[PDB]
Design a binder for this molecule. Structure first.
Ligand SMILES: CCCCCCCCCCCCCCCCCC(=O)OC[C@H](COP(=O)([O-])OCC(O)COP(=O)([O-])OC[C@@H](COC(=O)CCCCCCCCCCCCCCCCC)OC(=O)CCCCCCCCCCCCCCCCC)OC(=O)CCCCCCCCCCCCCCCCC
Ligand SMILES: CCCCCCCCCCCCCCCCCC(=O)OC[C@H](COP(=O)([O-])OCC(O)COP(=O)([O-])OC[C@@H](COC(=O)CCCCCCCCCCCCCCCCC)OC(=O)CCCCCCCCCCCCCCCCC)OC(=O)CCCCCCCCCCCCCCCCC
Ligand SMILES: CCCCCCCCCCCCCCCCCC(=O)OC[C@H](COP(=O)([O-])OCC[N+](C)(C)C)OC(=O)CCCCCCCCCCCCCCCCC
Ligand SMILES: CCCCCCCCCCCCCCCCCC(=O)OC[C@H](COP(=O)([O-])OCC[N+](C)(C)C)OC(=O)CCCCCCCCCCCCCCCCC
Ligand SMILES: CCCCCCCC/C=C/CCCCCCCC(=O)OC[C@H](COP(=O)(O)OCCN)OC(=O)CCCCCCC/C=C/CCCCCCCC
Lengths: 84, 92
């Protein structure tokens, strides 16, 4: 019967490894939230980057020609040197 | 009839209106049937993290092209009256 007790004692020997695995599975389930976090950050920080990085970050969809007709810096509407 | 008195009661045509229950009739089922084929629910809505990503990425793209569309509308309506449309001629 001591053998049985040995098995019952030993079935929890690896508690630290099992609790680590538990938390590793909670973190695995939280990785998908990155899909929304990262684009939201770049969405809020877009105005911080320089124009050439704005263009590259959007694969060229955004460029200087895409700035609004009334740019917040009116002297730079239509380009850095103005419309004409 | 009886409008404006304590005898007011629903006219006949309102009673007939409320007698039409449209039981067992669905004239808009085609819309939902075709909408479901986009698989938006299976791909995005069902999972909360993907639901958030749809709102964020959709808002990002939607906001940009919404601005783009109405900027073109503004340029068309005000054609010939914008600063860019009328290059200035310097006096000699
Ligand atoms: C991001 C993209 C993702 C991928 C692509 C996605 C593509 C899909 C996009 C889909 C977009 C939505 C389209 C509409 C879907 C159908 C309607 C719906 O929601 O169904 C749910 C549900 C369906 O009804 P149900 O009773 O459950 O149906 C049961 C059975 O299916 C059938 O039951 P039944 O057969 O027994 O019928 C019962 C019921 C069935 O219910 C209905 O069918 C009635 C409700 C239909 C609403 C339709 C909404 C359309 C959306 C507007 C789009 C605007 C485009 C503008 C373009 C501008 C571009 C810049 O009908 C009635 O109760 C009978 C009376 C109905 C009276 C309705 C009066 C509407 C008059 C419209 C006149 C328009 C004239 C325009 C002239 C313009 C000239 C230039 O309807 C609603 O809940 C909708 C009405 C809610 C109140 C409306 C709020 C009004 C205030 C806002 C005003 C501003 C509008 C802004 C529009 C924004 C658009 C984005
Ligand atoms: C009798 C009456 C009849 C009435 C008929 C009415 C017809 C209905 C009309 C509606 C349309 C019908 C279409 C029929 C298609 C038939 C063919 C077929 O079998 O379809 C395949 C299939 C149909 O599903 P199924 O065959 O029944 O399979 C069911 C499965 O559960 C689902 O399959 P699955 O998920 O296993 O595989 C789908 C797979 C198909 O694709 C693949 O398998 C490709 C996999 C990659 C292969 C390797 C490629 C390597 C190279 C890549 C190079 C390119 C890189 C760059 C790509 C950039 C892309 C942006 O991926 C996708 O389609 C997209 C999902 C990708 C993964 C999503 C999860 C990732 C995280 C997302 C985070 C959440 C937010 C995201 C952002 C949301 C937006 C803000 O998929 C679709 O048709 C669904 C399309 C999903 C895309 C979004 C659609 C929404 C946008 C609609 C716009 C509408 C505009 C309206 C304009 C109106 C003008 C007036
Ligand atoms: C199998 C598929 C592979 C997919 C990826 C590769 C193929 C993709 C499709 C083709 C495009 C290839 C890439 C081209 C990009 C060009 C961008 C460019 O030059 O833009 C111009 C801009 C501005 O350059 P410019 O100012 O000289 O002007 C460009 C010139 N004109 C104007 C004429 C267009 O440059 C950039 O923005 C350069 C960005 C480089 C970014 C490199 C990132 C590398 C990865 C970093 C990892 C960081 C995390 C580390 C983690 C550590 C571990 C935890
Ligand atoms: C393991 C192998 C993986 C690869 C497998 C093969 C398939 C994929 C291979 C792709 C390689 C080819 C990429 C071509 C890039 C051309 C860039 C260019 O000329 O930009 C000039 C543009 C414009 O240059 P500009 O700023 O000088 O503009 C001049 C404008 N005019 C003419 C009016 C004066 O530059 C940029 O926008 C800079 C950023 C570049 C964009 C980001 C990197 C490239 C992304 C490629 C995406 C490909 C997907 C399909 C297209 C998506 C868009 C609709
Ligand atoms: C759960 C708590 C959450 C708390 C969240 C707090 C609120 C966060 C608000 C997010 C704001 C995002 C940034 C907005 C920037 C706007 C950019 C813009 O419009 O640009 C204005 C204008 C544009 O000028 P241009 O001539 O085009 O040249 C600039 C360079 N290309 O100037 C700029 O872009 C400058 C922008 C500078 C941004 C600096 C960003 C880095 C700041 C670091 C913050 C670190 C915070 C750490 C907090 C730790 C707390 C424990």
């Amino acid at each position: 019967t001591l053998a049985v007790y040995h098995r019952l004692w030993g079935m929890t020997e690896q508690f630290a490894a099992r609790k680590k695995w538990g938390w590793r599975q909670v973190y695995h389930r939280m990785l998908p939230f990155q899909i929304a976090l990262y684009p939201s950050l770049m969405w809020y920080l877009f105005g911080w980057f320089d124009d050439p990085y704005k263009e590259a970050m959007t694969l060229g969809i955004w460029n200087v020609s895409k700035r609004s007709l009334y740019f917040w810096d009116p002297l730079r509407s239509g380009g850095d040197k103005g419309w004409y | 009839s009886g409008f404006g008195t304590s005898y007011a009661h629903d006219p006949k045509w309102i009673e007939d209106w409320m007698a039409r229950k449209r039981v067992g009739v669905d004239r808009m089922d085609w819309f939902f049937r075709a909408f479901n084929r986009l698989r938006l629910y299976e791909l995005f809505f069902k999972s909360t993290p993907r639901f958030y990503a749809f709102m964020v990425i959709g808002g990002l793209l939607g906001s940009y092209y919404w601005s783009r569309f109405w900027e073109q509308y503004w340029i068309r309506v005000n054609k010939g009256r914008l600063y860019k449309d009328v290059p200035y001629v310097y006096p000699p």
